[PDB]
């Protein structure tokens, strides 16, 4: 190859030829704002970079074609990033989220590798032929750490170091190199952190570092330079280019920097998702976050039960497992103000209301197949609840004050509730019994009400002891209805019939705005307190703080694994009972058909038609 030196500065990535020593040219990119960490992939000569202003990781070819953003969510300060050229994996470290993560080079199958007791991981270096990765930490007590490249066997390699940067492996000579930003030194050690040596002690401000053949290269922010010296003696110092202020990173682009082999290089280890290098020449198959590795040690299966919780501009997933796996952002594009969420466990698709767009939208959990279900004539959806058997979304409309019903593919079913003085807000459906529950925020008269799923059999359950009942949940197994009142700052429950009303919690609650049932636990979100909390409906283990310091909480929704055999025993799950619009569970074990308020049931007693 032609050996190239690439460097980031401001919003540009530029290249200097190392055989001509002075030919400088910018990579023709658009949309970069703050270019930071750099790497490349030897097999296709793609370049990769992070951006601290956009909080993204992107890749492109050096002529600017195939510009793609491969990581776009869940980053804060992605200051370290490296390409695993053998397994075709992308690694990065974030000083904001305190995480080291991996994905495929196109961003698929993101997994969190290190997150516990991690204080600002900054500079990252990979050795996939051996199976180790190395990084510096800038938090608390700075240090250089080592782990397997599946995140296991984490150990401290260099304990006595300042904030360090430009961590670089000389793969040929088995040396580590870095700059110390607190002592302004360039140092080297062997792969075990031993045989330490100071390479240069007379540089005022060495920031970035890399290595190629007999030379180390660095940037100096006080000398506004990229410079080069003999990697063992520190001599033969030369100026690669001057008048370059604040160069954030430098990278030697040459195939000799990415050599070697591991099993991942040949058929990805027969791994379905990730092939991760593990120490001394090994490999292990890995899975996206919250997935599990099957008994064949090669294939991954998605989680069957989990918790979803939304913020203003993010939807997250949480699992309750022994590993205490971290929560993960879902990579759903174009969220602006998420107000409410739901999930279809049949087709495994997430649904949400965005009150900036006044839209109901849906996508798969990996963020693909984004689709608009409801859109504007002025609508303003407030809450939504899916009937998974008839395959309908029930949702409340704040502008027109109706309950409207829509098929999962966007075709409208119709409104089932409307009254001049009605203000339907929170809603949850119980298709197992044929009922729907909603809060009704009438002026000076808030209510909790229930009705059949076609709007008939409407009755007020509760009208006293309510100020702003803002969220509803229910559980068929427990046979219970749950609500939060953000004004009275308390959580209540009753039987689904409305009997046995009881306050569950009213202490240390500031602004409860959502709640959900997961097995025997009632979870809720406290917006003002920035917390998720849960309580045990059996009364045995009490009340637990699930996660704190979560800003802009908007909704929470638990997903239990679908019992497919049991699902298909619901009468409305088979062809909607033959009903064109609404299928009602009678309670006789039988089903009758019904219609939205603008249509009439026809003679076949299955079809709805336009009124005479």
């Amino acid at each position: 190859s032609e050996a190239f030196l690439l460097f980031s500065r401001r919003a540009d990535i530029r290249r200097i030829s190392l055989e001509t020593n002075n030919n400088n040219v910018a990579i023709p990119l658009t949309g970069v704002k703050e270019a930071s960490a750099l790497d490349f992939d030897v097999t296709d000569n793609r370049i990769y970079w992070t951006d601290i202003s956009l909080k993204t990781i992107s890749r492109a070819f050096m002529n600017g074609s195939a510009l793609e953003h491969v990581v776009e969510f869940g980053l804060d300060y992605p200051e370290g990033m490296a390409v695993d050229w053998l397994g075709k994996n992308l690694y990065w470290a974030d000083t904001g989220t305190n995480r080291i993560e991996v994905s495929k080079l196109d961003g698929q199958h993101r997994q969190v590798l290190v997150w516990k007791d991690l204080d600002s991981p900054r500079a990252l270096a990979l050795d996939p032929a051996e199976g180790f990765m190395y990084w510096t930490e800038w938090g608390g007590k700075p240090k250089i750490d080592r782990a397997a490249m599946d995140g296991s066997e984490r150990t401290t390699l260099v304990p006595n170091v300042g904030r360090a940067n430009g961590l670089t492996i000389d793969y040929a000579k088995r040396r580590l190199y870095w700059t110390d930003l607190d002592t302004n030194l360039i140092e080297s050690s062997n792969m075990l952190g031993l045989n330490r040596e100071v390479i240069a002690d007379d540089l005022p401000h060495p920031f970035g570092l890399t290595q190629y053949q007999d030379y180390i290269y660095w940037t100096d922010w006080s000398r506004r330079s990229i410079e080069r010296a003999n990697k063992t003696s520190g001599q033969n110092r030369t100026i690669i280019q001057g008048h370059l202020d604040y160069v954030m990173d430098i990278l030697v682009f040459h195939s000799s920097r990415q050599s070697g082999w591991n099993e991942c290089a040949s058929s990805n280890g027969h791994c379905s998702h990730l092939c991760l290098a593990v120490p001394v020449g090994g490999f292990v198959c890995g899975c996206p976050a919250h997935y599990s590795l099957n008994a064949d040690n090669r294939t991954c299966s998605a989680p069957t039960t989990f918790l979803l919780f939304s913020q203003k501009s993010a939807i997250n997933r949480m699992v309750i497992d022994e590993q205490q796996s971290p929560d993960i952002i879902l990579p759903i594009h174009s969220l602006r103000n998420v107000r409410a969420i739901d999930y279809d466990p049949l087709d495994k698709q997430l649904y949400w209301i965005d009150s900036r767009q006044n839209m109901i939208r849906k996508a798969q959990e990996d963020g693909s197949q984004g689709f608009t279900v409801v859109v504007s004539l002025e609508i303003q959806p407030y809450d939504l609840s899916i009937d998974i058997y008839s395959r309908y979304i029930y949702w409340t409309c704040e502008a027109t004050n109706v309950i409207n019903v829509t098929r999962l593919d966007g075709r409208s079913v119709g409104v089932v509730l409307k009254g001049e003085q009605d203000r339907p807000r929170a809603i949850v459906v119980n298709p197992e019994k044929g009922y729907m529950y909603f809060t009704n925020l009438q002026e000076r008269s808030p209510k909790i009400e229930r009705a059949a799923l076609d709007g008939t059999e409407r009755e007020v359950l509760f009208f006293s002891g309510l100020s702003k009942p803002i969220a509803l949940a229910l559980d068929s197994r427990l046979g219970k209805l749950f609500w939060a009142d953000s004004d009275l700052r308390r959580i209540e429950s009753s039987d689904l019939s409305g009997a046995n009303r009881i306050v569950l919690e009213d202490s240390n609650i500031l602004q409860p705005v959502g709640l959900t049932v997961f097995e025997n636990w009632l979870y809720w979100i406290d917006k003002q307190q920035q917390m998720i909390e849960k309580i045990d409906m059996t009364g045995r283990e009490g009340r637990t703080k699930v996660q704190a310091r979560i800003a802009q909480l908007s909704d929470i929704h638990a997903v239990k694994e679908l019992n497919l055999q049991e699902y298909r025993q619901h009468p409305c799950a088979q062809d909607n009972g033959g009903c064109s619009h609404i299928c009602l569970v009678k309670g006789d074990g039988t089903t009758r058909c019904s219609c939205p308020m603008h249509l009439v049931l026809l003679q076949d007693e299955l079809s709805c038609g336009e009124p005479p």
Binding site: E34, S36, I52, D245
Partner: peptide, 15 residues
């Protein structure tokens, strides 16, 4: 640009 400086640090062309 200049987010990194804002966290860890100023230069011109920043703000």
């Amino acid at each position: 640009g200049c987010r990194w400086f804002m966290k860890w640090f100023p230069p011109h062309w920043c703000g």
